Amino acid sequence: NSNICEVCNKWGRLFCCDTCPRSFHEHCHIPSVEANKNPWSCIFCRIKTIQERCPESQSGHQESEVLMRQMLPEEQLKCEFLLLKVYCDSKSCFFASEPYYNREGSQGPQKPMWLNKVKTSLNEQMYTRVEGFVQDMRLIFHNHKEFYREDKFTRLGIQVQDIFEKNFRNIFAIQETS
Ligand SMILES: [Zn+2]
Ligand SMILES: [Zn+2]
Ligand SMILES: [Zn+2]
DSSP states (O other): OOSSOTTTOOOSSEEEOSSSSOEEETTTSSSOOOSSOSSOOOHHHHHHHHHHHOGGGGSOBOHHHHHTOBOOHHHHHHHHHHHHHHHTSGGGHHHHSOOOOOOTTOOOOSSOOOHHHHHHHHHTTOOSBHHHHHHHHHHHHHHHHHHHTTSTTHHHHHHHHHHHHHHHHHHTTBOOOO
16 A cells, blocks of 8 residues: 555555555545445545446536436545545645635625535535535635635636546546537
């Protein structure tokens, strides 16, 4: 197994996947690494199994159809994995914890949102459709763009949104377009 966490790239108290060489901090994995379970398979491995069981699941889909899907166990898992792929980028730090807004010439968003809030919402099964999770994720970056205006810091929102959107298209097998 790797000697650094797959998500934050640090050493520490690491749990090792039994079916792949990745390792995780307990609360870096999503869901948090399960108490017992021998063997244990990481989210990467669990997603790869879904694909392998249903190869046709990789054919292209329309985003509108994916969004309306109910959050059954496979869709729950896919959203957890997509959230984890965002935390994998170091720039996610800016969006992880609860923000506050006090900048001359700007007003804070009406509905603040942040990664750890989405993480709790998934854990608590608060989303009934994929659409709920995707709307909160996109809200994080939209709030950031609106608040930071012409400050160059706006670009951090564009960057992490791009990581979200690429991973969304991969994980949910969105039909490729020009
Ligand atoms: Zn970690
Ligand atoms: Zn694994
Ligand atoms: Zn199948």
